[PDB]
From Swiss-Prot:
One of its GO terms (molecular function) is epidermal growth factor receptor binding. The chain holds residues 565 to 1042 of 1333 of the full protein. Expressed in gingival tissues. This is Son of sevenless homolog 1. It is linked to Fibromatosis, gingival, 1: A form of hereditary gingival fibromatosis, a rare condition characterized by a slow, progressive overgrowth of the gingiva. The excess gingival tissue can cover part of or the entire crown, and can result in diastemas, teeth displacement, or retention of primary or impacted teeth. GINGF1 is usually transmitted as an autosomal dominant trait, although sporadic cases are common.
Length: 445
């Protein structure tokens, strides 16, 4: 059964399995290994391993550069034949071609095909990486393998090239259409604020590739960064709109309008937006505004209290709602980032055996299983009309200005103490900052 393989100095993937290079947990599950050993099992001669191909291509950037992965799979493909025994039947050589060279070479090409189909951004970010891939597959000879080169070439071409019902009418309130200079929390219609923020957040959620969350929660993660900045900017914008409205009556109208935006986020199944509002309402500057929340109606308090209970017990009620909901939806994105940090903290980058270092692949596998849950909600377009001016208003939100986040939250907290001083101190009287009406048009379209 064991075949005659080429020398380890002429082919690096021929080294036997040992505790210095691979550790396993009916395909065996890899716990840890060197990059050479991971690449070997990624293109194993004995069997196909699509779950390992999927997980490896999502996580390898946390232990290997794309340029190194390409160099190593080319090295894996270029198998030298062992030296003959002075020779001819050539039984072991014919069998080495059939049972080792052919399956490994086919498996390298299957890894290339999965790499260009599901992770083309690696090639978009580095033109020379694509140039090397196209050059490598171009040197592949043989009819059976030219079919794999044709499919890889068609996928590269395809990647280079790249309503269910009638959407409802766009809603307007004080700010007339196109009057961008007046666009603000109380001047735009609360329904349209919630519809446009949902389209913005649905596009941002859909643009996040699973690999962007591996070993990182800039080039590596552009869409994750844009998603996190949006959530920070929108949450802090809600807080700023609340505490910078010093007049009690106007601040009640601001808080009440944000709760109405949350109701429409609930109707739209935008759980990301629901929990952005909850996060703003639970922040230290807002949560302590007892005089403000005293004037909020009971029905609006119930809405906000129930939206908070979605996060209790590690998001228990949220997960039940998400599963029981019909698309379209925008799932809460923060939970993936929390679970990835919980998985990665205290989890070692490497295992050490006999002075040698092995990459901890279990750590990468557990992160991939979390990120794999993101994609099932990324092909759910909303049946809502985009409003370019409102979208641009929410894209350019910059509440912090030049401040750093922590310092800005301390400013928000001190603004909260100015507008509602602590119990002994009197409640001051502040002038009105808005001359337009505060009455909401409601959440009914
Ligand atoms: C049911 C619940 N809700 C919460 N926070 C929500 C988001 C809320 C915030 C603010 N600021 C005002 C209201 C209200 F009710 F007055 F409108 C509600 C909690 C926050 C911390 C601990 C337990 C919590 N339990």
């Amino acid at each position: 059964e064991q075949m005659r393989l080429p020398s380890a100095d002429v082919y690096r993937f021929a080294e036997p399995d040992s505790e210095e290079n691979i550790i396993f947990e009916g395909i065996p599950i890899i716990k840890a290994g060197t990059v050479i050993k991971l690449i070997e099992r990624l293109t194993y001669h004995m069997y196909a391993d699509p779950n390992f191909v999927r997980t490896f291509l999502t996580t390898y950037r946390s232990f290997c550069k794309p340029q190194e992965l390409l160099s190593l799979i080319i090295e894996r493909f270029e198998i030298p034949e062992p030296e003959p025994t002075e020779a001819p039947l050539s039984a072991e050589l014919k069998r080495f071609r059939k049972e080792y060279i052919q399956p490994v070479q086919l498996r390298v090409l299957n890894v290339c095909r999965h790499w260009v189909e599901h992770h083309f951004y690696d090639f978009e970010r580095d033109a020379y990486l694509l140039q090397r891939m196209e050059e490598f597959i171009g040197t592949v000879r043989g009819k059976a393998m030219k079919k794999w080169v044709e499919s890889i070439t068609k996928i590269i071409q395809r990647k280079k090239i790249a309503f269910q019902s009638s959407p409802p009418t766009v809603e307007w309130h004080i700010s007339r259409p196109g009057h961008i200079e007046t666009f603000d929390l109380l001047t735009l219609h609360p329904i349209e604020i919630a519809r446009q923020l949902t389209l913005l957040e649905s596009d941002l959620y859909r643009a996040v590739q699973p690999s962007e969350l591996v070993g990182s929660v800039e080039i590596n993660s552009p869409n994750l960064l844009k998603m996190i900045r949006h959530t920070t900017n929108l949450t802090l914008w809600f807080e700023k709109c609340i505490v910078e409205t010093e007049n009690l009556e106007e601040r009640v109208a601001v808080v009440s309008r944000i709760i109405e935006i949350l109701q429409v986020f609930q109707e739209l199944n935008n759980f990301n937006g629901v929990l952005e509002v909850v996060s703003a309402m639970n922040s230290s500057p807002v949560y302590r505004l007892d005089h403000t929340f005293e004037q909020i109606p009971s029905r609006q308090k119930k809405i906000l209290e129930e939206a908070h209970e979605l996060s209790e017990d590690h998001y228990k009620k949220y997960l039940a709602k998400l599963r029981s909901i019909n698309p379209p939806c925008v799932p809460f994105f923060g939970i993936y980032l929390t679970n990835i940090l919980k998985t990665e903290e205290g989890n070692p980058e490497v295992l050490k055996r006999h002075g040698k270092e092995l990459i901890n692949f279990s750590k990468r596998r557990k992160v991939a299983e979390i990120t794999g849950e993101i994609q099932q909600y990324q092909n759910q377009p909303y049946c809502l009309r985009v409003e370019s001016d409102i979208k641009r208003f929410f894209e350019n939100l910059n509440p912090m200005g030049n401040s750093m986040e922590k310092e800005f939250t301390d400013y928000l907290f001190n603004k909260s103490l100015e507008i509602e001083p602590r119990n002994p101190k009197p409640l001051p009287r502040f002038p009105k900052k808005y001359s337009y009406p505060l009455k909401s048009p409601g959440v009914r379209p």
